[PDB]
């Protein structure tokens, strides 16, 4: 279940 | 403005910190206190983000002292984390040889929670091993926990011999 | 991965 949050989270600024 | 950047070298956020730390302006915020007198440093090598220690490093931080007299190498081998470790002693070398209120150094730290490639990082370096207010190396205070691993790789290692000869003769449980 | 998790999280409307 966390590799599912880590695969369907929304990230922005905190790219690259 | 403080506390985000707490927040965020606490949890390794690296963009947040780049861009509270985008102006260079007043240091005072760099090198803060806290609650517990934590500086950033602290925060960021206490969980263990060396790329967030690498960059409060590269823009200037004083390794402070805790309330506790702890310093960033003390919480990195506290925890264990040998590559905020590896980024601190390549900086400066006197932060090793520096003394707790209780007279530990990071070795001490190192040995007592059982991290063997902590106490390896530390041991090839120059550790300047010394007793503690109760008159007790870091092999003592290894020993007193059970800690098989680190022991047995201070055997394996080349300061056995210098190791072996350090302890008070006057202790009753340190001999 | 729960480290990463908080590392690479976007807070908005939950800061300082």
């Given at each position: 279940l966390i590799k599912l949050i880590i695969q369907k989270m929304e990230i922005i600024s905190e790219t690259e | 403005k403080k506390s985000p950047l707490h927040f965020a070298a606490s949890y390794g956020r690296i963009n947040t910190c780049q861009r509270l730390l985008?102006?260079?302006?007043?240091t005072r915020l760099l090198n803060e206190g806290d609650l517990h007198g934590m500086t950033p440093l602290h925060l960021a090598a206490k969980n263990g983000h060396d790329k967030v220690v690498q960059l409060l490093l590269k823009k200037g931080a004083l390794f402070l002292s805790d309330?506790?007299?702890?310093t960033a190498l003390h919480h990195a081998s506290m925890g264990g984390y040998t590559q905020t470790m590896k980024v601190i002693l390549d900086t400066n070398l006197k932060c090793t040889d520096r003394l707790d209120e209780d007279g530990n150094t990071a070795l001490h730290f190192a040995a007592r929670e059982g991290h063997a490639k902590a106490v390896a990082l530390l041991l090839s370096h120059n550790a300047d091993i010394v007793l503690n207010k109760q008159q007790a190396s870091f092999l003592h205070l290894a020993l007193h926990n059970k800690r098989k691993e680190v022991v047995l790789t201070i055997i394996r290692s080349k300061r056995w011999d210098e190791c072996l000869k350090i302890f008070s003769h006057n202790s009753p449980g340190n001999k």
């Amino acid at each position: 279940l966390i590799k599912l949050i880590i695969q369907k989270m929304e990230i922005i600024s905190e790219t690259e | 403005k403080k506390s985000p950047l707490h927040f965020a070298a606490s949890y390794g956020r690296i963009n947040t910190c780049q861009r509270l730390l985008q102006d260079i302006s007043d240091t005072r915020l760099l090198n803060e206190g806290d609650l517990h007198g934590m500086t950033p440093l602290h925060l960021a090598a206490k969980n263990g983000h060396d790329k967030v220690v690498q960059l409060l490093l590269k823009k200037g931080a004083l390794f402070l002292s805790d309330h506790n007299g702890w310093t960033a190498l003390h919480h990195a081998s506290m925890g264990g984390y040998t590559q905020t470790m590896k980024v601190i002693l390549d900086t400066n070398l006197k932060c090793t040889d520096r003394l707790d209120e209780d007279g530990n150094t990071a070795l001490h730290f190192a040995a007592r929670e059982g991290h063997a490639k902590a106490v390896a990082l530390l041991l090839s370096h120059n550790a300047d091993i010394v007793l503690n207010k109760q008159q007790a190396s870091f092999l003592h205070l290894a020993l007193h926990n059970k800690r098989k691993e680190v022991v047995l790789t201070i055997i394996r290692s080349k300061r056995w011999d210098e190791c072996l000869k350090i302890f008070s003769h006057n202790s009753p449980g340190n001999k």
